[PDB]
Amino acid sequence: SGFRKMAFPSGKVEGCMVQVTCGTTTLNGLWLDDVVYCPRHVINYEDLLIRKSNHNFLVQAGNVQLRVIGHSMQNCVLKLKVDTANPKTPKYKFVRIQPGQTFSVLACYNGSPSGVYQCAMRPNFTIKGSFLNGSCGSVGFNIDYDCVSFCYMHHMELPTGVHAGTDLEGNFYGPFVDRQTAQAAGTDTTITVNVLAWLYAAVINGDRWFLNRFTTTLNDFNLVAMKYNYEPLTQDHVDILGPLSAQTGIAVLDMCASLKELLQNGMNGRTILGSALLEDEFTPFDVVRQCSGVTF
Amino acid sequence: SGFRKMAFPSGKVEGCMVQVTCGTTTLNGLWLDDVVYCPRHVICTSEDMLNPNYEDLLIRKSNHNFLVQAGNVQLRVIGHSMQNCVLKLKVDTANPKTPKYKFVRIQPGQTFSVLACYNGSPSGVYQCAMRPNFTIKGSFLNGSCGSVGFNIDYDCVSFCYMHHMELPTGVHAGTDLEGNFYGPFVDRQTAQAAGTDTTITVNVLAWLYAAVINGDRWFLNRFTTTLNDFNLVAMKYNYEPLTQDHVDILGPLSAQTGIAVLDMCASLKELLQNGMNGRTILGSALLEDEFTPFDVVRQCSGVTF
Numbered sequence: 001s002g003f004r005k006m007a008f009p010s011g012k013v014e015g016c017m018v019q020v021t022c023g024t025t026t027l028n029g030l031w032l033d034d035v036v037y038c039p040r041h042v043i044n045y046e047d048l049l050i051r052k053s054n055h056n057f058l059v060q061a062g063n064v065q066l067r068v069i070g071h072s073m074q075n076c077v078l079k080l081k082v083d084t085a086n087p088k089t090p091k092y093k094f095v096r097i098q099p100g101q102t103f104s105v106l107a108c109y110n111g112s113p114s115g116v117y118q119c120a121m122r123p124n125f126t127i128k129g130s131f132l133n134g135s136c137g138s139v140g141f142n143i144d145y146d147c148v149s150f151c152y153m154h155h156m157e158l159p160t161g162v163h164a165g166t167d168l169e170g171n172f173y174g175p176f177v178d179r180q181t182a183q184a185a186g187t188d189t190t191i192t193v194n195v196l197a198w199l200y201a202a203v204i205n206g207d208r209w210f211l212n213r214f215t216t217t218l219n220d221f222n223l224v225a226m227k228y229n230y231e232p233l234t235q236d237h238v239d240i241l242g243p244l245s246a247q248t249g250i251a252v253l254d255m256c257a258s259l260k261e262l263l264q265n266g267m268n269g270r271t272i273l274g275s276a277l278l279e280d281e282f283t284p285f286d287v288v289r290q291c292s293g294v295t296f
Numbered sequence: 297s298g299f300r301k302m303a304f305p306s307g308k309v310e311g312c313m314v315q316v317t318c319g320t321t322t323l324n325g326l327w328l329d330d331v332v333y334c335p336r337h338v339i340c341t342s343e344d345m346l347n348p349n350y351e352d353l354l355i356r357k358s359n360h361n362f363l364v365q366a367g368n369v370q371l372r373v374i375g376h377s378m379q380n381c382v383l384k385l386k387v388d389t390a391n392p393k394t395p396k397y398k399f400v401r402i403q404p405g406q407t408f409s410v411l412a413c414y415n416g417s418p419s420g421v422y423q424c425a426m427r428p429n430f431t432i433k434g435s436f437l438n439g440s441c442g443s444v445g446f447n448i449d450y451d452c453v454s455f456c457y458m459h460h461m462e463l464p465t466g467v468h469a470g471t472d473l474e475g476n477f478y479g480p481f482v483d484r485q486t487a488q489a490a491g492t493d494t495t496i497t498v499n500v501l502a503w504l505y506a507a508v509i510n511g512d513r514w515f516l517n518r519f520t521t522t523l524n525d526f527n528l529v530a531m532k533y534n535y536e537p538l539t540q541d542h543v544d545i546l547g548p549l550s551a552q553t554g555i556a557v558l559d560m561c562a563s564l565k566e567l568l569q570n571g572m573n574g575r576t577i578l579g580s581a582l583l584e585d586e587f588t589p590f591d592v593v594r595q596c597s598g599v600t601f
């Protein structure tokens with residue numbers, strides 16, 4: 001029993017974090033095999049890069065200094081070829097996630113990990129993270145069995161306190177650019193499929209006060225959800241919620257009718273899984289994993 | 297910017313998790329140097345849990361009755377002893393991944409990271425606090441016994457909790473790493489229940505200071521309060537008494553924001569009276585009590601917005 005925002009064990013990623021310094025800027029890098037990946041803003045990027053030599057980049061892994069032997073740019077990510085392969089390189093993949101998908105973040109400063117937390121890629125492509133100056137180059141990841149899937153690299157903070165970054169191939173999530181200019185997070189929406197998953201998690205943990213005898217059509221549910229800034233629920237989302245619907249015996253469109261009533265009438269002084277807000281940062285898979293006991 | 301429930305990086309603890317099996321029971325163990333620490337109820341069956349005589353169950357065991365597995369490697373047990381509610385299994389191999397560590401006993405209101413494990417394999421990490429009633433609101437399923445709580449300061453891991461059981465209300469009870477339970481709990485299936493829980497007042501105040509640092513002051517007011525009058529009001533909402541020690545501990549947060557502790561106490565009094573009126577504080581519609589004054593200082597900026 002119990003429901004917590006749970007992050008993946010960070011050990012495999014901790015062994016990859018390094019400090020990168022170029023001139024007066026210092027941020028974090030990801031050391032995989034003989035390459036260090038970090039935001040290219042550590043340095044017209046092609047014009048700034050051509051003026052740099054290998055010895056201009058200071059890479060530090062713990063107390064050991066790594067020697068840079070080459071450098072190249074891939075989108076908004078700088079790839080520093082180092083002379084030593086990382087002996088702690090885990091099995092890994094670089095993956096691009098979609099809005100609504102969650103991941104763990106290992107927040108680092110000076111190449112040293114400070115904390116780990118869970119978060120979701122918002123529909124507006126920003127993340128509500130906890131980052132201070134020096135956190136650039138911190139990474140987001142998921143773990144499947146023994147393989148770390150790197151999905152995020154931190155690049156910047158937006159005026160509203162939210163965060164923007166790239167996948168590990170340097171392609172930004174969202175319409176953001178890596179420069180000082182007027183940039184703002186677009187209007188955000190609630191991840192509907194995730195709120196439904198978390199309502200199923202509450203039924204598994206014994207919270208059923210919000211259930212009712214009523215059902216709804218998928219179209220009528222979407223007409224109501226569009227009014228409360230909720231993402232449209234698709235037939236794919238309904239299919240994905242299938243195992244949670246089977247484990248609890250509550251049809252997806254019946255859970256949709258419970259959410260329809262909570263959107264109109266609120267919670268009335270009550271809470272769900274210790275929350276007075278409808279929580280959208282747990283995917284259907286996160287609910288299944290936490291209510292099963294999946295290990296790595 | 298931003299404020300999240302942040303756990304310590306779990307890597308140093310992951311390298312210590314092992315699987316312990318005694319007969320038909322399998323749970324987790326903590327491998328530090330040449331010793332494996334685990335809950336002593338690993339030697340019990342379900343029937344034994346009603347009235348276990350651990351000394352009598354233990355005397356019937358030999359070293360080879362304990363199966364310890366570190367990854368795919370089998371560790372050989374060469375000795376065993378009981379210390380309160382923990383079993384200490386002397387193994388033939390020292391853990392090469394043993395971090396610098398201490399065993400510390402925490403007080404209610406203190407937070408820590410939990411590495412939830414099943415079959416000696418870590419599955420997830422989360423942050424939580426020792427509640428005033430000595431239970432923890434964790435997320436544990438069957439097989440999680442032996443999972444540990446810890447803090448990491450500098451390169452030193454301070455182990456403070458080992459998971460032993462789930463109470464009827466879904467909350468959890470465990471021991472320090474010397475086997476002494478937190479709270480009036482026993483490692484026996486008895487009619488024991490979590491006592492009435494209360495809100496950790498010093499932590500709610502710390503989190504209100506964190507909201508001020510991150511640029512939010514809507515909840516402040518022009519009033520102050522005496523410490524005694526604040527406690528008379530706070531006890532009515534099931535909040536823990538705020539002591540002079542708590543006021544002293546909140547000093548650096550009071551200085552960084554320029555808001556006196558008893559002035560923040562007056563805002564808390566009003567927030568309890570009024571609720572939030574559709575507003576949130578650090579993305580929460582409830583008053584959050586699982587961030588200590590020390591957690592706020594560690595996570596938040598040293599410059600107020």
Ligand SMILES: CNC(=O)CN1Cc2ccc(Cl)cc2[C@H](C(=O)Nc2cncc3ccc(NS(C)(=O)=O)cc23)C1
Nearest residue numbers: 001337345436437438440441460461462482483484485
């Ligand atoms: C609620 N479980 C029980 O009534 C049985 N328990 C009795 C008992 C009594 C004292 C001590 Cl020290 C240990 C224990 C055991 C115990 O609490 N371990 C567990 C710990 N944490 C989460 C757990 C979720 C579930 C779970 N068991 S189950 C198949 O789902 O019933 C055990 C869990 C076993």
Ligand SMILES: [Cl-]
Nearest residue numbers: 401402403406
């Ligand atoms: Cl303490």
